[PDB]
Design a protein around this ligand. Structure first.
Ligand SMILES: O=C(O)c1ccccc1Nc1cc(Cl)c(OCCCCCCCCCCCOc2c(Cl)cc(Nc3ccccc3C(=O)O)cc2Cl)c(Cl)c1
Lengths: 115, 115, 115, 115
């Protein structure tokens, strides 16, 4: 699995469960063609987004639907979504975890890149 | 001043100086229209992007060009940029400060919204 | 002003107001001695803790009383407080800003150090 | 395993490997008696710190030796260590993960608490 997503909730100290995640890749014509998506699991994780064959170098965007998550808990949020835009770079063996930590008015994201 | 941006560098413990910042506003046809842009000052701040008149309700995207910054420091970062997308002014006019904290493989963003 | 503290609330998107802050300095016998204390203002800032004279080289601990803050908001947070421990002034006198970003189950802290 | 620690490196986008972690518990006489410790693994994790029998309600401190980590990479850091102080609360089934994300001049910590 070359690309995983992991989301945490800073208010509840828990995985952020049932969070919608969309991944896009920059296309020839500079358009963000949908690439993959899913909903975080009970552990706050989303695996199986893509395969190594499909996950070529390129610019990618991972959009995390944070606004719907906070609405489902009844907490007024600032952002429409959290967005993580990065270039995948095919330098030998590499797996990518995009982690996000959510609060109503803040978020952090980190990339954990391993061989 | 209703929209300010503040950038910090988590590696040097300093303001993130001369960082490019572009603001877009979502238009009628779900296209992102250029709204305002500038560069952070020596204090890592960017003021005077807009006016209370011009800064109507809408969905805004504040794109902070973090890759060019880290590059200029001789570091190949993970992200292309930090992007913060939010509805503004939807319960009336407010003053928004968008803060970002930058590392090569991570960033954090918070909004401070006042009367 | 060589030591300032800035607190933000990631849940309300506001400064974290009236937050208690205690500073200690490590003494000769590896005991923490009371150095200075105060509460954040309406802007979430705490200035005038010390003077350039009094603020000598040493190991300092800035304890931010985050539990009492979240309690006063009706939230039972994870942490007892945020604690930031650092050597100060060890390459000469500097100006230190300790920023913290608070959620119930998470916090972030950064130092901005200038001439 | 009732208490785990996980540390990430924001500069390198990697687990923070071989990082010293000490856990202390507040003692009768308000002293921080060493409770457990170890070094993060290749995955940035530390498990097996304590057992459910031993991990009673109480105030705990998890000290992460961030300064030695940054020194081993040759990057000047601000903090002496990252410290996470919290009360363990014995409310039914609960496991605690203390996650920390490190940069030279900043860190974030989060508690992920599951049943
Ligand atoms: O990944 C697993 O496996 C994992 C598994 C399990 C758990 C976790 C796991 N992973 C995981 C763990 C964690 Cl902890 C994570 O957490 C990362 C969190 C990083 C957050 C840091 C944000 C700090 C922002 C402070 C900015 C302050 O700026 C300001 C300043 Cl300095 C001054 C002023 N005032 C002024 C003064 C003067 C003039 C104008 C202003 C003016 O107003 O601008 C205003 C501002 Cl706003 C993540 Cl992402 C992933």
């Amino acid at each position: 699995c070359p690309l995983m997503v992991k989301v945490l909730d800073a208010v509840r100290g828990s995985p952020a469960i049932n969070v919608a995640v969309h991944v896009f890749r920059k296309a020839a014509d500079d358009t963000w063609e949908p690439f993959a998506s899913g909903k975080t699991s009970e552990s706050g994780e989303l695996h199986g987004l893509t395969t190594e064959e499909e996950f070529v170098e390129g610019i990618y965007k991972v959009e995390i639907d944070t606004k719907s998550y906070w609405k489902a808990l009844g907490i007024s949020p600032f952002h429409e979504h959290a967005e993580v835009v990065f270039t995948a770079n095919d330098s030998g063996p590499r797996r990518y975890t995009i982690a996000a930590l959510l609060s109503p008015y803040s978020y952090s994201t980190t990339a954990v890149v391993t061989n």
